[PDB]
Amino acid sequence: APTNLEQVLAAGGNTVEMLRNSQIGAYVYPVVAPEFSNWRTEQWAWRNSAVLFDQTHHMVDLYIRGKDALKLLSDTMINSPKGWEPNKAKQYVPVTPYGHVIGDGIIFYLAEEEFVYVGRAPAANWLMYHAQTGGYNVDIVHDDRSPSRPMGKPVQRISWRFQIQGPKAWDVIEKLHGGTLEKLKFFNMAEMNIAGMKIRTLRHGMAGAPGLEIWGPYETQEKARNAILEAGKEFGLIPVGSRAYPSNTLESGWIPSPLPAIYTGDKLKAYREWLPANSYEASGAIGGSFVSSNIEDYYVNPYEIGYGPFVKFDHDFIGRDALEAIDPATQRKKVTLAWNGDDMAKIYASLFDTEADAHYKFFDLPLANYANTNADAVLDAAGNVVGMSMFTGYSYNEKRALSLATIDHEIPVGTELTVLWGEENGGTRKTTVEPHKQMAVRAVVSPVPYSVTAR
Amino acid sequence: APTNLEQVLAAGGNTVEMLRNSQIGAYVYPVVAPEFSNWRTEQWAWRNSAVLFDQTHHMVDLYIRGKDALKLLSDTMINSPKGWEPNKAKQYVPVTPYGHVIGDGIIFYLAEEEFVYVGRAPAANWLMYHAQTGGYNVDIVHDDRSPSRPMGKPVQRISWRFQIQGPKAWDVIEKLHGGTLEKLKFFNMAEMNIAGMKIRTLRHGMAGAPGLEIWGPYETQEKARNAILEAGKEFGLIPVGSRAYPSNTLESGWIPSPLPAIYTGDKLKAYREWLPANSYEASGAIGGSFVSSNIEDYYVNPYEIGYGPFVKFDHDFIGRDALEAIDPATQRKKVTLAWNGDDMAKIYASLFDTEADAHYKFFDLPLANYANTNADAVLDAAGNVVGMSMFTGYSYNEKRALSLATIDHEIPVGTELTVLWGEENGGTRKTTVEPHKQMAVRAVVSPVPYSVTAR
Ligand SMILES: COc1cc(C(=O)[O-])ccc1O
Ligand SMILES: COc1cc(C(=O)[O-])ccc1O
Known part of the structure; x- marks a missing residue:
């Protein structure tokens, strides 16, 4: 009978007790093989040789186009939009009117009036809610993360997304490109050659070594993957499977899983009425030893999980007054x-x-x-x-x-x-x-x- | 350049060293989700409530039809064919002329001149080799096990195959059937009702409790699965994923993985010339601490892995003279x-x-x-x-x-x-x-x- 999160919470008893006893199961990193060699060797390779991370299946993609696309992002992110031009990506972080993190993802500025969000569902849901109800002249295409248990059904995405990382990554990258490739500033975008294709790139890296995120239309996924694996054999590159993959952030330091802080607050009721009953927010789970009967005790604000440096009070955005009231120190x-x-x-x-x-x-x-x-x-x-x-x-x-x-x-x-x-x-x-x-x-x-x- | 196993061994150095250093990777139980709840709870359920085992994807199926189908099996199996009639299955075990196990699988006698083998690749390869080169009037359809890493590609089989097992399995089975279902003798076949379908059954069981293997055309897989899961909720039935699934045999006692004993012997050269260079036998791996430079030290005969009781000297079969020469005691x-x-x-x-x-x-x-x-x-x-x-x-x-x-x-x-x-x-x-x-x-x-x- 409940069709949205608000009705789920009204009928579900204590919100913490509901989420901590949810029947959703594991959070799955889907479709990619759990292992290609073994997860220990795969972990070792990203610090000692090179790896292909297959990021095609575990994140939600939002394609955001239109006159008001930049305004939508600016109105909802803590990040400064000042001087943002195409071919620069940002780590988009939205907070609620109360100053708490909803989620985060990578926002690519692809061209004039053309953006793509890549990340977990919560920040994508927030963008879609505001695009739809806030009067923004913008068109959004939602490409969900892949199903957790496809059980033999075919899986499609609009784009494939890989990363090439490791101390020998740049060697592999330049071998693919056919020559020297400039190392741009972090999160600046350009292009490279892969098997005769012009592939857009995002400057990236890990464990003190430069690398790239790359993407393209789903149709060319196998052509790019096979070229990368072939060129990388000389440098010991191996593909990483879904078992090892998410453990990379334990070393890199990014917390993927803040609770979307949307379960309380009068100013968030409209959003709770918009979120479906089968949304991430309504159907997911909280695990672990921390117990409170107040769901707000599970919230974090951006200073607490490392995004303090992103906060810039140079634009109007949701939650700005609350963040200005916080003492960062x-x-x-x-x-x-x-x-x-x-x-x-x-x-x-x-x-x-x-x-x-x-x-x-x-x-x-x-x-x-x-x-x-x-x-x-x-x-x-x-x-x-x-x-x-x-x-x-x-x-x-x-x-x-x-x-x-x-x-x-x-x-x-x-x-x-x-x-x-x-x-x-x-x-x-x-x-x-x-x-x-x-x-x-x-x-x-x-x-x-x-x-x-x-x- | 090598197109068959014989050429692979001639060019590959010591056979043991080749197999023990093979680059094939893990033996994968494909397609089925690794976990539905968690592997500990799933293991617990098959001893304490009930489970749905999804067997659709990890075995090779051989559909064998024709005037000489029974003769082909009889000529190649240690098992007695005497009195074998449709609606009885056997654990088919073929040995080489030298008395060593090639593999094993389940052979279903479906109707006159109609059989299906279900098992790992080695015994299926042996059946196909003899069907093709031995002059048998028989037609074979080979339905391989599913790809190990489908990576989003669709997966098809000719048939789905499930088992319902656990102390409450028979309760679930009779709830599905709509009433009492007779417990036949082990490995006798009959039928049951599932969601208005007539589903063929194989009497099975584990841990002292009767159960069933069931199968049908791939098209009805979801209809049957959803009916089973729904009826079984009353009895605590849960689906088992591919991580827990193969550990069941540690409790049940069946050894799935004897080395196909086909790498040596003049009488097996023709078979080695027939086996492709990318076969299970040519491309697979041997792991573990046992070291010999003679691949024959990895072979087993049927008495050594529990199939002694299947051996019946009441028909002509490959390896009979060698088995007759063995002292079982x-x-x-x-x-x-x-x-x-x-x-x-x-x-x-x-x-x-x-x-x-x-x-x-x-x-x-x-x-x-x-x-x-x-x-x-x-x-x-x-x-x-x-x-x-x-x-x-x-x-x-x-x-x-x-x-x-x-x-x-x-x-x-x-x-x-x-x-x-x-x-x-x-x-x-x-x-x-x-x-x-x-x-x-x-x-x-x-x-x-x-x-x-x-x-
Ligand atoms: C950026 O892709 C990642 C996603 C997650 C996640 O959502 O839990 C974890 C680690 C990752 O590297
Ligand atoms: C009969 O299905 C099974 C196959 C295997 C295997 O091939 O390793 C292991 C356990 C099993 O239950």
Whole structure:
């Protein structure tokens, strides 16, 4: 009977309890093969040789064209639009009127009055809502991320999107291009040759080495992929599968999964009435040890997850007054948490204990998340909640379990905190959750992007 | 340049070294979603509620019709054909002229002059070779297993094939049928109602509870699946994904992966010349600690992997004279090995050791195989090789790592052996293999199907 999020929340009891017991299952990185060689070798390659990341299937694409396209973005993003011209991309971050992050994605300025958003569903839903109800002269084509379990059905996208990354990426790129290719400034766009095609590029990189994101019409996907794999054999390039792929951000430092902060607030009711009952926001899940009966305690603002530097008070935008009221110097800060290896061994050991009444929450490798929004409590030595751990897994490059978190600003790097791993009372009813007991895992605060930190 | 297996072996150096360093990658259970809920809950359901196993995509189907169909099977199988009539299936096991197992699969006797084989590629390749070159009046339609990495391409089969299993399976089955359904003898075939369709059935079961395998034309797959899932909600039935699925045989006791024993022998040269260079036999891989430079040391005969009881000297068949010469009472015997939980914890602990020069071979969960043929050495206390471990993984139902093995017949159940886990010299060049050191894992000999055994 409910057709939108507002009706779902009115009929669903406590919002936190609903989301933490959602039956949606795992957040899937679809279609791309889970592994091409093995996930350890694939992780190793992006730090030691080169990789092809296949990004064609796990993000929503919004193609935004028209006289008011730039205005729509400017009105909804914290980012400065000043001096923005085609062939520059930005990390689009929208906040609510209350100053809280809705989501984020990459916005490509392709040409005059022509943009494309690439990212998770929440910020795309927000753009579509405003395009439709705000009176913008703009046309939008929504190309959803691919189905999670296609089960043999054909899958189409409008565009393929790859990245070539690793210390030997630029060697592969120039071999493909047929000569030297200029390294532009980060997120500037140009073009390159691949197998006789003119392929648009986005300057990118990771682990201190320059790389590229590239895209094109879906029809040429195989032609480009096969050229890249062939040219890259000389440099050890290998394709990365969907099992290893999302663990890259544990090393790179981007938190993909802030809760869209749209469940409360009178100024967000119209948006809740617009969001379908089967939307990401209505049907998804929250997993982890952090418990509050107030869904607002799961929200973050942009300063808390590393987007402070993007905020520019040089244009009108939704939530500007709220962000202006925030003191940046006292906001929580994004960090990497390096999980204690002895504690990790104890988590896994419990799976092989035939006599214990319970084991610790299964920690999948290399990505351990079990909802699309992750919220584990971070505790200090007294047991106070001092932060939220929001993305969790393991790096074969570091031989460490790692998580990305936001913690009280005064906590120094090197401090040993605890992450509460697992859920209370045997676990919520999410279909990703087997029965388990919790563990207070020791974790050392470390920089983002991750760098090995002395305790 | 090589077009067949014989040319591949002539140009490829030592046959063992070729197979143990093959670049084929993992043996994939394709297309079906890796997980629907999570693999632990899915494993639990087949012992505690009910499951839908989706078997549509991982086996080769051979449709065999014609006057000489039964003769073709009879001439090539160790099984008795005496009194075989439509609506009975058999576990077809062919051996070479030298008495060694080629493979095995399920052969359904559907009607007069109409059969279907379902199983891995090796026994299907053997049937096709003899149908084609032996002068049999028979027509064969080969429906390959689905591609390992479809990457969004559509996937078709001629038939869908499911199983409904678990202690509540028969409740679900009778709910679907609309009333009582007779439990026939094992592997006898009949029919049932599903959503107004007449669906053919094969009497099956596991863990002491009766179940069914069912099939039909691919077009009705979704209609049947949705009816089964709907009727089964009352009994807790859940679908099982491809990650959990193949671990079922660790509990059930069937070894899927004997090496097709066709690489040597003058009487098998014609078959090697017929097998394509991209066949399973030519392109696949051998993984694990057992090392011999003679590929014949990887062969098994039917007595060694539990098919002794199928051998019937009441018909002419390939390899009969060799099997008649074998003494059944002194052959190695199939067992389950229950791996020591402390040793398992030490394997996983090494992944989180930031100072060690090496870690132990990654043991994936719930299936740890990293080739399509598995060959780990089993050692006694003196270090003698006393068997071969051939399929490896973990059961959440038992909280134990388990493997299926064949060992010297005189070794009593309860004996503590060791399985050598990992490969020598840092590991072979297979793309599934990360660098690692070996471990002698303690393992207790246990019955097949697995039953908890006092040491
Ligand atoms: C940019 O693509 C990514 C997306 C996600 C996600 O949505 O969880 C994670 C890591 C990624 O690299
Ligand atoms: C009968 O289907 C199965 C096939 C395999 C395989 O081929 O490795 C393993 C377990 C199975 O249940």
